[PDB]
RNA sequence: CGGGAAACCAAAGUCUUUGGGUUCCGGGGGGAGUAUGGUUGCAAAGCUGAAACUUAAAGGAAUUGACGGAAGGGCACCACC
C-alpha cells in the first residue's frame, strides 16, 4: 500500500491464513491461530519459541483447522509420517 | 468539559490492556481479530472524537392479549471521517434509550475501511482499491472507485454513511428495494467492511505477522483479583 | 397445595445453610432462635416461615445429599470416600483373552504380550 | 452437450478455490485453455500446473495459491476495437490498475497490458483478477 | 505522450494557469482531478476590488464595477 | 522424531495404550478422520493408529505449554467417563475446568459467573461437548479434542483419536496429556516414567 | 458452502465478483381469455386475442394477536357435579 513517495499508508495489513493464504479479515472472531512451543531438541524443556500458525474462520468451520495444523506441523516439523 | 468522568471498570482483558495504554490503537484488536464486547473500549481507542448519527425514528408494533403495542427503532450510524465506522439499530421504550443503546451497538459493530486511489496515487486514498457490494435481504449497494471530485454519488442515507467512514469519491448503484432504509444501509456497510477482505496483489506478501497484545500482556490482562 | 414456600423464603434457607450448616440443628425451635442471630429479618412469621423451611431442608440433608446444596463440611465427606481402589480389578488374572484381530493389532504392533483367541462371526446391522 | 470448454475449466478453478482447495483437476484442456492457463501464470494468479495425456484430449492438474478472486470467462467471444477494450477493463475488473481483461489477436491469447504495448487487438475469452 | 493528450492537456493546462485558477504541479491533469469552485470565484472582479484596500467589501466592489 | 530422539515411541507407552484399549476404533469412519485409520478389523471394527494417536497428542502436550498462564488452558468434560479425568488435569497442569453443563454464555457473555477467557479449549467429546466447541468459536479460542473416529471436525483444530466409546481411553489420554505437559515446559524432566498411577484418571460411578 | 423476500432450496447452488447452449412466457390490478377477424370442431367448445372504461393498491412471505361448531391443555359452585 505505497503512497506517491514509497511511502506506506492505509492503516494495517492483515494476518493471512496459514492454509489457504487468504485475508483474515478483521472482524471474524470464529477464527484463530496456534502457536506450538519450540522444545530445546533433545527433548522436553519448551524453549519458546512459538512455531505459529493461523487457521481462517472457513478452513475451521469446514472441519480442517487440525489437518491443516498438520501439513503445518509436519512439513515444518515436528510431525512425522503422519 | 467537566461532568465527571464515570468509573469504567473493565470486564475484559482487551479492555484492561487499553486503559492501561498498553492497546492504543484499534488496529491491534482488528488484526488480532479481537472481539470487542466492551463499548468503552472502543470509546477510548477511537470515538473520541468520534461523531454519531442518528438516521431514522420509525416506529413499528405487535399484538398483545387485550389488543396492542407500538415502540420506537432507531437506526444509528458511527464513525470519525478517517477509515472508521459503525451501524446499529435498535428498538426500545423510548428514543432516547434507543437512540442511546443504538449508538452503543453501532460502536461495537465499528468496522476497517480500507480507502484506496481510483489509479494515480498521489497525496493519499481518495476512494477505494477495489469495487466491493453488499446485500441485505435483497437490497445490494455497489460501491465503484470514482475519480478526484466525483464525490460520494449515493443517496442521502448512503451518503452519510459513507461520509463518516471517510470515503471522499465512489460511486454507487443499488439494487433491490431501496425504500427499507435498515436494509439498504446495512447492504451498504457490508459493502465498505468487504474492502478488508479483498486481496491485491499489494497484499501478496505474508508475515512473523504478530503475537498478540493478548499474550504479550497476558499478566497485565489478569489484574489481581479474580 | 395451598402452602408452597416462594422463593424469599427457600432462597433464605438455601443461604444460611450455606454459611451456617454446622450451627443449624434437626429442630425448628431452635433455628428459629439462630435466624435472630445470623440474619435480619423483617416480620416474625417470616423469619418463622423461613426456619421451618430451612429445618425441613436440614431433615433431609441429614439422610442424603440434596440437589443444591453445599456445605464445607460435606464437602470434606465426599473428599474421603472419593478416594476407593482395592486389590483391583484389572488384573486381569493371568493373560489376557484377545478377539485376534486385536491378536493381529498387537501382532503387527511390534508387541510381546500375553494371549489368548475366540474371535470369529458376521455380523449383522441394525 | 459441450459448446465451449473453457468455460468448463475456468468455472471449477473458481469452486476449487471458493472452496478453499489447492489443486484441481480439468477436463478435457485445450490449446487456448493452456494458452489462459498460462497467462494466469505468468502473473501469480495460479501456481504451477501440468496436463496428463489420456489418450484423448486431456487432462490438467493446476496447483492454486490464494490470490485469485476470480477467473471469469466472455462468452461469446466478441470483436474488440482497440477502444473497446478500454471499455471492456473498466465494465469487468476491481480498479482501473490490476486484474487483467485477457483476449485472443492475430498476435496471440494475452492480458490486455500485452495487447496495448503490441499495439494489436482482437476478441475477448476472459479475465482475471 | 498520446498526442490528443499531449496536445490538449499541456492547453488544457496553461489556459487554466493564465488565469490564476491552477498552478504548476497541479498544472498537471492529475492535480486538476483533485481542485475547486473558490479557485475561480476568487478571480473575478469585486473580490479584488476588496483584496486591495481599493474597495474595503466584496460589496462595495460590485456596486463599483 | 523431529525434536529430536527419545521423544519417539517408547513400548511402556504402546503398552499402557493398547491395554487402555485405545485404538479399537468406531465402525463408522466419518471422512475427515479416515487418516488416522490403520485398518479394519473383520467383524467391524477399526485400528486407530496409536502411533499417530501418539505423536498427535505429544503435539497437543506442546501447544498446552507455550500458553503462559497455565490456569487459562480451559480441560473441559461433561461426559461422565471424562470428569474425574479432567478434575485431575487441571490439578497437576495449571489448567481450570469446565465439567457437566458447560452453561451457555461462558465464553460470550461478560456479566456471567462462568465467563472464561481461555487462551486453549481441549475438548473430550466433540458431539457432547457441542455448545463449548461451539462458543469457542465466537471468540478466536484453539480446540484440542478428543476424537474417536466418527466425531465433528467443524471448529477442532488437532484431534487426538481415541476410542472414547470409553473405559480407561479417555482416562489414559488425558493421563498422558498431563504427564507429556509436566514433562515440557513443567518440571518432570528426564522424560522418564510416573510416580502418578494412570487410574487416578478414570470414572468414578455408583454405589449399590 | 452457497442461494432466496422468506417459506424453503444439493438445486431454486456456482447471479452486481451480474456473460456454458438453447426455447418459452410476463411488465400494477380489474375490463378478460372478454369483444372482434381468422382458424379447428358434427356439437359442446378450443386456439390466437384487443380496447373504451375502471382503480391505488392488487398480490407474496414471514410475525404477532384476536377468534374457531380444529387438537391437547387447564382453572372457578360469578362453571358443572
Redesign the pocket.
Known amino acids: 500500500m505505497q503512497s506517491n513517495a514509497g511511502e506506506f499508508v492505509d492503516l494495517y495489513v492483515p494476518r493471512k491464513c496459514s492454509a489457504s493464504n487468504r485475508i483474515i479479515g478483521a472482524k471474524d472472531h470464529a477464527s484463530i491461530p496456534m502457536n506450538v512451543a519450540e522444545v530445546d531438541k533433545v527433548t522436553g524443556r519448551f524453549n519458546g519459541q512459538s512455531k505459529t500458525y493461523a487457521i481462517c474462520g472457513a478452513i475451521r468451520?469446514?472441519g480442517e483447522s487440525d489437518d491443516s495444523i498438520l501439513r503445518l506441523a509436519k512439513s515444518h516439523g515436528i510431525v512425522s509420517q503422519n | 468539559g467537566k461532568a465527571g468522568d464515570k468509573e469504567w471498570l473493565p470486564v475484559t482483558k482487551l479492555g484492561r490492556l487499553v486503559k492501561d495504554m498498553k492497546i492504543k490503537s484499534l488496529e491491534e484488536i482488528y488484526l488480532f481479530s479481537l472481539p470487542i464486547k466492551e463499548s468503552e473500549i472502543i470509546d477510548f481507542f477511537l470515538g473520541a472524537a468520534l461523531k454519531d448519527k442518528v438516521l431514522k425514528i420509525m416506529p413499528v408494533q405487535?399484538?398483545?392479549?387485550a389488543?396492542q403495542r407500538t415502540r420506537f427503532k432507531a437506526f444509528v450510524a458511527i464513525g470519525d471521517y478517517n477509515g472508521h465506522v459503525g451501524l446499529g439499530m435498535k428498538c426500545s421504550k423510548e428514543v432516547a434509550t434507543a437512540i442511546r443503546g443504538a449508538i452503543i451497538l453501532a460502536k461495537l459493530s465499528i468496522v476497517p475501511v480500507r480507502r484506496g486511489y481510483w489509479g494515480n496515487k498521489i497525496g493519499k486514498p481518495h476512494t477505494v482499491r477495489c469495487?466491493?457490494?453488499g446485500?441485505c435481504?435483497?437490497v445490494?449497494v455497489?460501491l465503484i472507485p470514482a475519480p478526484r471530485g466525483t464525490g460520494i454519488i449515493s443517496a442521502p442515507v448512503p451518503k452519510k454513511l459513507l461520509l463518516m467512514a471517510g470515503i471522499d469519491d465512489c460511486y454507487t448503484?443499488?439494487?433491490?428495494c431501496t425504500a427499507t432504509l435498515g436494509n439498504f444501509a446495512k447492504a451498504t456497510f457490508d459493502a465498505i467492511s468487504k474492502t478488508y477482505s479483498?486481496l491485491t496483489p499489494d497484499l501478496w506478501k505474508e508475515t512473523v505477522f504478530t503475537k498478540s497484545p493478548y499474550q504479550e500482556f497476558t499478566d497485565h490482562l489478569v489484574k489481581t483479583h479474580t | 397445595m395451598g402452602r408452597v414456600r416462594t422463593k424469599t423464603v427457600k432462597k433464605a434457607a438455601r443461604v444460611i445453610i450455606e454459611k451456617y450448616y454446622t450451627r443449624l440443628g434437626n429442630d425448628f425451635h431452635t433455628n428459629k432462635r439462630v435466624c435472630e442471630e445470623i440474619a435480619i429479618i423483617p416480620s416474625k412469621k417470616l423469619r418463622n416461615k423461613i426456619a421451618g423451611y430451612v429445618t425441613h431442608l436440614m431433615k433431609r440433608i441429614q439422610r442424603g445429599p440434596v440437589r443444591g446444596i453445599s456445605i464445607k463440611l460435606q464437602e470434606e465427606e465426599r473428599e474421603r470416600r472419593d478416594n476407593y481402589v482395592p486389590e483391583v480389578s484389572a488384573l486381569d488374572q493371568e493373560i489376557i483373552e484377545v478377539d485376534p484381530d486385536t491378536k493381529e493389532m498387537l501382532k503387527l504392533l511390534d508387541f510381546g504380550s500375553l494371549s489368548n483367541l475366540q474371535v470369529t462371526q458376521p455380523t449383522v446391522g441394525m | 452437450?459441450?459448446?465451449?470448454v473453457l468455460?468448463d475449466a475456468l468455472?471449477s478453478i473458481?469452486?476449487a478455490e471458493?472452496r478453499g482447495k489447492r489443486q484441481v483437476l480439468i477436463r478435457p484442456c485445450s490449446k487456448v485453455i493452456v494458452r489462459f492457463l498460462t497467462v494466469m501464470m505468468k502473473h501469480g494468479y495460479i501456481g504451477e500446473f501440468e496436463i496428463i495425456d489420456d489418450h484423448r484430449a486431456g487432462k490438467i492438474v493446476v496447483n492454486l495459491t490464494g490470490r485469485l478472486?476470480?477467473c471469469?470467462?466472455?462468452?461469446?467471444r466478441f470483436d474488440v476495437q482497440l477502444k473497446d477494450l478500454e471499455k471492456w477493463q473498466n465494465?469487468?475488473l476491481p480498479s482501473r490498475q490490476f486484474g487483467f481483461i485477457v483476449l485472443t489477436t492475430s498476435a496471440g491469447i494475452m492480458d490486455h497490458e500485452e495487447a496495448r504495448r503490441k499495439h494489436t487487438g482482437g476478441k475477448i475469452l476472459g479475465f482475471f483478477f | 505522450k498520446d498526442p490528443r493528450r499531449l496536445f490538449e492537456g499541456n492547453a488544457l493546462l496553461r489556459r487554466l494557469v493564465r488565469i490564476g485558477v491552477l498552478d504548476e504541479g497541479k498544472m498537471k491533469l492529475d492535480y486538476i482531478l483533485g481542485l475547486k469552485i473558490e479557485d475561480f470565484l476568487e478571480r473575478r472582479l469585486q473580490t479584488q476590488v476588496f483584496k486591495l484596500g481599493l474597495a474595503k467589501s466584496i460589496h462595495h466592489a460590485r456596486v463599483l464595477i | 522424531s523431529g525434536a529430536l530422539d527419545v521423544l519417539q515411541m517408547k513400548e511402556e507407552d504402546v503398552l499402557k495404550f493398547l491395554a487402555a484399549g485405545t485404538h479399537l476404533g468406531g465402525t463408522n469412519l466419518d471422512f475427515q478422520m479416515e487418516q488416522y485409520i490403520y485398518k479394519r478389523k473383520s467383524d467391524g471394527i477399526y485400528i486407530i493408529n496409536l502411533k499417530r494417536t501418539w505423536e498427535k497428542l505429544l503435539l497437543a502436550a506442546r501447544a498446552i505449554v507455550a500458553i503462559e498462564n497455565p490456569a487459562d488452558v480451559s480441560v473441559i468434560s461433561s461426559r461422565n467417563t471424562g470428569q474425574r479425568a479432567v478434575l485431575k488435569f487441571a490439578a497437576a497442569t495449571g489448567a481450570t475446568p469446565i465439567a457437566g453443563r458447560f452453561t451457555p454464555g461462558t465464553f460470550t457473555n461478560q456479566i456471567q459467573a462462568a465467563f472464561r477467557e481461555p487462551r486453549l479449549l481441549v475438548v473430550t467429546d466433540p458431539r457432547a461437548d457441542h455448545q463449548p466447541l461451539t462458543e469457542a468459536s465466537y471468540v478466536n479460542l484453539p480446540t484440542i479434542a478428543l476424537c474417536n473416529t466418527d466425531s465433528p471436525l467443524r471448529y477442532v483444530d488437532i484431534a487426538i483419536p481415541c476410542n472414547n466409546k470409553g473405559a480407561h481411553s479417555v482416562g489414559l489420554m488425558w493421563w498422558m496429556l498431563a504427564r507429556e505437559v509436566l514433562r515440557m515446559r513443567g518440571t518432570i524432566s528426564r522424560e522418564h516414567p510416573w510416580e502418578v498411577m494412570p487410574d487416578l484418571y478414570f470414572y468414578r460411578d455408583p454405589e449399590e
Request: zero cysteines.
Open positions: 468451520r469446514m | 405487535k399484538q398483545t392479549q389488543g469495487k466491493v457490494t446485500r435481504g435483497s445490494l455497489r448503484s443499488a439494487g433491490g479483498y | 452437450v459441450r459448446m465451449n468455460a468455472k473458481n469452486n471458493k478472486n476470480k471469469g470467462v466472455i462468452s461469446p465494465n469487468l
